[model samples]
Target: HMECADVPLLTPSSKEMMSQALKATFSGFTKEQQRLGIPKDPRQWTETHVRDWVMWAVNEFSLKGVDFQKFCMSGAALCALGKECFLELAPDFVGDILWEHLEILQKEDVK
Candidate 1:
């Protein structure tokens, strides 16, 4: 299940610091809640939406006897990429490292 962080709308920090803050926030959640992945739909998303989706995914993973850890990790990677990409084109502001990482991921997939 994925635990969604209470991410700040704006923050003063380096890229690593921002990423660390996001990770730390998620880590503080209960194990049961943290396993869920983030919600894909932005229109219906709130802080709690991702958590609820994750909880549901956890149940499915258990029933299917899936490797929950790998599943969650893969989801986390995608979440980070998506979040970074969204921020890049979001008009309000852009995060350079976020875009850089997104580019790296895209290039890796192309090879």
Candidate 2:
């Protein structure tokens, strides 16, 4: 096990699944396929990258009230922040999804 908290898996809510399918809708749009200008490695991301990435998440998940400035740190700063600290910027499931997506990028990079 890693040093991170044992966050629970997400249960499928109808609305959430609809958003999930939006992810599925573009099979090529996986975490690895982060759009142009975004680095494949979270460690390489800049403040601009952080904002752009989180902005995409906000639009994708229909999340609200996210202070993009709070997330305007480098990706290394972001991963170091961890899940609980990331939640400080955006509450509830918004933090969960953002952290999970960042985790996915980290995981993908390690391989």
Candidate 3:
């Protein structure tokens, strides 16, 4: 429910239960996010933008394997697509995959 500011809602789309691939994302309020068609804040953004950006980013430079890595260093996107990517790409290596990103995200508040 919208009542819980921290709780999340359902995502917009999914290609197929067994065939969809990894998705990417961005955080922070940079024009670069807009320039890259990525979401400024994964917690509060549109599905249209996130999904669109994934396609745009992948197609823009023919992205493959963490091409959008830096943008995913923080925020809900990581919690969302990060897991999606791992689950889809590494079904048996879920923990292994999440650890890589988590290790980085853990440093999000570093000085």
Candidate 4:
């Protein structure tokens, strides 16, 4: 089981966390809910939403126990790869958003 602290500093960025959150939140949703997308407000976020998406991802991907770990490792690896491959694709855009997300997570940790 991974805690927030166990996730590592990863250079104080939320790129990984945001990507994980998006995957966990979206992958667990039905095709319908996924297409509909997330609500605008963070406060509006709910565990039920997360649970629904996680369950969906687990079943859809046929992931179980150790398989889940593999899924995460692969996902993170892919994210890194994408960043490298598309480094010049959107230089300012993607990096800025990821850095911002990381700052948000870091502040949350302080509280």
Q: Which prediction has the highest lDDT against the true structure?
A: 2
The estimated TM-scores of all candidates read: 0.23, 0.71, 0.30, 0.26
RMSD of each: 14.3, 5.8, 15.5, 15.3
CA deviation > 4 Å runs, candidate 3: 1-32, 35-38, 63-78, 81-111
lDDT of 2 by residue, 1-111 (tens): 122332236754455554454455335334524554787788888898888878877766678877887897998899899878988988775776777777778887972
**Which runs in model 4 stand beyond 4 Å of their true positions?**
1-30, 34-43, 66-111
* TM-score, prediction 2: 0.71
Ranking by TM-score: 2, 3, 4, 1
**What TM-score quantifies how close candidate 1 is to the native fold?**
0.23
Q: In candidate 1, what are the lDDT values of residues 36-63, reduced to their tens digit?
A: 5333332333435433533443342222
User: What does candidate 3's lDDT look like per residue over 20-104, in tens digits?
Assistant: 2221322322444666554434444344544444445444334445333334333455445655454454324333333342333
Candidates by lDDT, descending order = 2, 3, 1, 4
Lowest-lDDT window of 10 residues in candidate 3? Answer: 17-26
Give lDDT per model, in order.
Answer: 0.38, 0.71, 0.39, 0.37
Give the CA lDDT, 0 to 100, for residue 37 in model 2.
Answer: 73
Candidate 3 TM-score over all chains jointly: 0.30
Compared with the true structure, the alpha-carbon lDDT of candidate 1 equals 0.38
Tens digit of lDDT per residue, candidate 4, span 1-111? 112443545565654554555455433443635565533232333444333433444454354442222122222232344433423322344333332332333344442
